[PDB]
Amino acid sequence: EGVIVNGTQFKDTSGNVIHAHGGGMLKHGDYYYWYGEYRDDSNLFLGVSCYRSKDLVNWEYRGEVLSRNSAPELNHCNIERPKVMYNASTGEFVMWMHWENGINYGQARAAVAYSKTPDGKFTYIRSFRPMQDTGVMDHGLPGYMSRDCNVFVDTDGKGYFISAANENMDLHLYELTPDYKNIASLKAKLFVGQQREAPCLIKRNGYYYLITSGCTGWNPNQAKYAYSKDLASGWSQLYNLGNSTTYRSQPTFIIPVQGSSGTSYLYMGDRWAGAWGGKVNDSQYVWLPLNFISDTTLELPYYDSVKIDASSGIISEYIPDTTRYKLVNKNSGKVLDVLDGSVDNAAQIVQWTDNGSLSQQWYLVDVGGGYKKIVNVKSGRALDVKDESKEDGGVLIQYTSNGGYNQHWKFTDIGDGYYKISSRHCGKLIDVRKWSTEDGGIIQQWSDAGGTNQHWKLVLV
Template sequence: MKQVHPSCMPSILERWARSARVDVRQASRMKRLLAVTGLLLWMPLLALAADKPATIVPGALWHDRQGEVINAHGAGMLKAPDGRYYWFGEHKISGKGGNAAHVGVSVYQSSDLLHWNARGIALPVSKDPDSDIADGAIIERPKVLHNAATGKYVMWFHLERAGHGYKDARVGVAVADAPAGPYRYLRSFQPNGQQSRDMTLFQDDGGIAYLFYSSERNATMHVTRLTDDYLGTEQDYQRLFVDQWLEAPAIFKHAGRYYFMGSECTGWKPNTAHGAAATSPMGPWTEFGNPAQGDDAALTFHSQSAYVLPMPGQPGRFIYMGDRWNPENAIDGRYVWLPLQLEGDGFRVDWHASWSLDEAQKTHVPSR
């Protein structure tokens, strides 16, 4: 091997370093060129993807922006003053025991109802075994309203304490300063001393709010007004659909008319939906039969009602939001969202294997 004289070493090393720096700069420029070229090649495809409306596929796995499957069952939807939507739901775990609350109420945020950001657990189960919402309690159908007068966000849900089965039949109430929480649990009770299982909230014009709940061992639906701060109920209530055995209430309004959608009581198994309309939330309500139409309508497309949301920017159009329960593996319950259309004195829900909000906008809504 040829030997290098020590006096030549500094100059050789300097030349080598200069050459290495040039190679690094050239490689860096080449990487930038390739990146720009790749972006230019992909831009037409990205533009096509942006122009294509995102679709809703009822019953399919629905992933959030973080790539995880959305875990928010028995949905409650809130459109906050900031214009964004918040999806609250029961956080399930795998297995038969997954229907009990082992984590809490989850919350997701979206600006378009299609792409959802996970915001974590809005209301966690308590570490205190004596708490109403201790691990193993039943926390179902969380619904949240914003109280403009107090500035608070108030969550209500069906509550059964851990180890009590479905014997308690209570509502639970929690409050927060921001839509995604964290929510602070306040208390549980039976509204007006009456049993309350499946329930929902409805906020009317002027901020008046109502609680609808399945009572009298699920035989009869009740409705009562919330107090002005949304933290309790007024003393008067009305009995609706007496001895009809209905649960899973969802309430919405259009043009001064109120609409009810609920299901029969068959446990976790799907059944026939019931529709009704009224000129006041307190009733009287007039039933008009099953609003679901077409194949599998008798089983409400293998789903159960959770919420009905006005379609954004489309007055008079709505979205039916239901759950396809899986009691053998609770975490694998699926969401069934479908366009809901007013028709005559009632409304209808038709099956769509997939649909987009843009397509729903083209659907004709009969004039009243």
């Protein structure tokens, strides 16, 4: 039962609430290490916890790799977004983070630490504003500002540190020295004046991807991403990822989960309790699979429950009810199907002859109220009303699950095993266009006209 419940606070093997807010993760040896920070009673840096696991679901407490006692300036300060990266050359784990006074946010500087072991007590080095010696001034103080940050290890073995500079208006990608403990140069300035925060830098197939969020404090916002063949330049524009609130969370880190089957990228987020007036320690987590439609097209679906099998390297949706179904039209006798039995995103939904194919099988996931999710089997995508249309003739397609109301359907029994499937968005029924009785009939959205082409029978398979 390697299943995770989003919008909650995961508990370690001890039965205690895990506290690794704004943290990250590292895969070394046979274990996945989850680092993160958490405040205390005075809302100040208490320690950077570390959790270990092989299955990515059951986490074991390993103590504070970094404490407010590790250094004199760590006593009264704010530390957030601690990330850990490994150095093959040295053989030591270097840790970066964001440091503040604890009184204000004027000292926008980064901090560094390291240890010979992953779950061992890290030794604090220093806190500083990148390029301090260069003499450059960034808003009153010497050295570039450095708030929200993150680390990245490239294939060639070069380390990289990214953070928000120039009053969170610009993103600075710093290239680290071979030891990872220092900054060698300013690789490139990314997304100037666009004000992107909580950056996550990853790589897949010669393509670099940068997942960022907006700057609105606790308030969840529209997350975005970009791609490029080179870190220095060639970066694309910003493309929306997830919904308008990133499913009520803010991105913190993204790691490739490699296994026997293949590689599945995991998304980590934070549901900051500050949204509803709660303390930082009351923040919950949101883990979702990061799917790659193409080298240039990304998908971030929302599953209320996610199943993970680290061994095989597979991250998919958890269906509470594996019962398969077929939707037969009263008028045509055809069943609900996907065009060309495609698994592509936004694939057109059509009616087709009952051929017992996978494309013609659907799950029914309750999503609160009297509404449900109609999910295809051959492709984990959900039945969706294209472009959240509220008009007659609105085409129906299969789209990535995003909790939108245009993906919620209520079944209304009319007798004899037939139902009227209305959308939660406008209330229009699932309709076979023009009363079509042939294969490939476009499935659409239409007002309840009492037609038999709008009536569907639910059949077990």
